[PDB]
Design a protein around this ligand. Structure first.
Ligand SMILES: [Cl-]
Ligand SMILES: [Cl-]
Ligand SMILES: [Cl-]
Length: 129
């Protein structure tokens, strides 16, 4: 599924992400835009052999099991393929654990490089939330 901007903002808000650990909804929408272009099916391979999965490009090195990332952890206790669903629930619950980990949303490289310190409220402008 490729979410529309406001559609995803609403789904994210419903799943408790608005101001979760202090990060306004715009931050989350911005992150998803640059991580996956709002596509729940996005996968991308990393140089170390891990893979990033779904709307928030959650990494098999730490957070999910894909059975092909030697030495990795599965801290969200889910198969990586569950992060590719049209329903964002699994990605959101895992994202809550990631963002609580210590470095906040800096865990998402695209958030740090493209969203952090920007006018993130523009991502939710005009949306019915
Ligand atoms: Cl915002
Ligand atoms: Cl593995
Ligand atoms: Cl959803």
């Amino acid at each position: 599924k490729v979410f529309g901007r406001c559609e995803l903002a609403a789904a994210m808000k419903r799943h408790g992400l608005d101001n979760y650990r202090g990060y306004s909804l715009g931050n989350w929408v911005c992150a998803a835009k640059f991580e996956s272009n709002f596509n729940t099916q996005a996968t991308n391979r990393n140089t170390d052999g891990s893979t990033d999965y779904g709307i928030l490009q959650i990494n098999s090195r730490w957070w999910c099991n894909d059975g092909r990332t030697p030495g990795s952890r599965n801290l969200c206790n889910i198969p990586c393929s569950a992060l590719l669903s049209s329903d964002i629930t699994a990605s959101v619950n895992c994202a809550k654990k990631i963002v609580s980990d210590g470095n906040g949303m800096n865990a998402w490289v695209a958030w740090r490089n493209r969203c952090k310190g920007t006018d993130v409220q523009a991502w939710i402008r005009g949306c019915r939330l």
